[PDB]
Amino acid sequence: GSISTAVIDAINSINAIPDDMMDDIYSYAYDFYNKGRIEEAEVFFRFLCIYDFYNVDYIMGLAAIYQIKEQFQQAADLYAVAFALGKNDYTPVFHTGQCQLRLKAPLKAKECFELVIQHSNDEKLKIKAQSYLDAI
Amino acid sequence: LKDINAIPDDMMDDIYSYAYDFYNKGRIEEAEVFFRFLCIYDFYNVDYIMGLAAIYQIKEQFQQAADLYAVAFALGKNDYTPVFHTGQCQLRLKAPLKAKECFELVIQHSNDEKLKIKAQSYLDAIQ
Ligand SMILES: N#Cc1c(N2CCCC2)n[nH]c1N
Ligand SMILES: [Cl-]
Ligand SMILES: [Cl-]
Ligand SMILES: [Mg+2]
């Protein structure tokens, strides 16, 4: 998957696609996604993540697809990458908590939701995180 | 290769220990071969990734190290040691605001008190 590609690239380690074209491909990926063409969107986000894995917008798009497809471990892993890339957005941490609950890891999920409540300034996200904590 | 148990668990432990032996002895080229071997065998092993990232950081391949540290952080979820080392790499890449954000994240989230002491010492040096 995207992560193994990133690691292989680093084991083995040119502006082949301009920024404007990458922007266009990202918009096409969401066109597919928004129409329910999840498989085509997944290919396009995987393509983007092969070219530029360390891009928070590409990673978040792919992580969303895996969460929808109930591939919760892959989703949680990518959301954690997204947080490392975007340290001030707790949305990926919230979604990681959801994934951990589905993975039968409620203590990991609780820690995710607690991080949101302590550190996020998104008041609506904090309510959602608290609703999960109340159920745990 | 890990998924198919191509090498027994005890032998992999030995290879990891030998990799760290080379590392501790300054035999960086040999350690790099061994940590690359480990990461081919199991790309999802956070300690194998961290070992290769450490070698790249020693060799001043700071962007390559930072890239691997981001993966290592994601796979480990709650260990901020890779984030601390990413902060060091960002300082060497002349990106002090990125480094500051890394060290601050360690302070805000980590429960590793010795690691937070180190992160704060870096924050204290950053202008
Ligand atoms: N899963 C998980 C997790 C966590 N985060 C922080 C960054 C994303 C995952 N912190 N503590 C945990 N148990
Ligand atoms: Cl993968
Ligand atoms: Cl900077
Ligand atoms: Mg607050």
Please answer whether residues A80 and A98 qualify as being in contact, where contact means their C-beta atoms are separated by less than 8 angstroms: no
Q: Which ligand is nearest to the CA of A112?
A: 1
Instruction: Please list the alpha-helical segments (H only) found in A13-135.
Output: 19-34, 38-51, 56-68, 72-85, 91-102, 106-119, 123-135
Query: DSSP label at B3?
Result: G
**From the candidates B2, B38, B43, which should be mutated to test the interface with A, based on the most A CB atoms within 10 A?**
B43
Whether residues B36 and A11 touch (CB distance < 8 A) is answered with: yes
C-beta atoms surrounding B65 within 10 Å: 26
How many Å apart are CA A12 and CA A35, to the nearest integer? 38
- Signed CA dihedral, B53, B64, B96, A61: sign only: negative
What letter represents residue B41's amino acid?
Y
Q: In this structure, what token pair is assigned to residue A111?
A: 């820690």
B10: number of Cβ within 10 Å? 7
> Residue A129 carries which side chain, given as an amino acid letter?
A
Deposited experimental method: X-ray
Interchain CB distance below 8 Å, B43 and A13:
no
- Rounded CA-CA distance B118/A116 in Å is 25
CA atoms of A93 and A82, how far apart (whole Å): 9
Measured between CA atoms, the residue of chain B closest to residue A54 is B67
Q: What is the DSSP string of B32-66?
A: HHHHHHHHHH-TT-HHHHHHHHHHHHHTT-HHHHH
Distance CA B7, CA A36 (A): 43
Considering only CB atoms, B43 lies closest to which of A7, A87, A115, namely A7
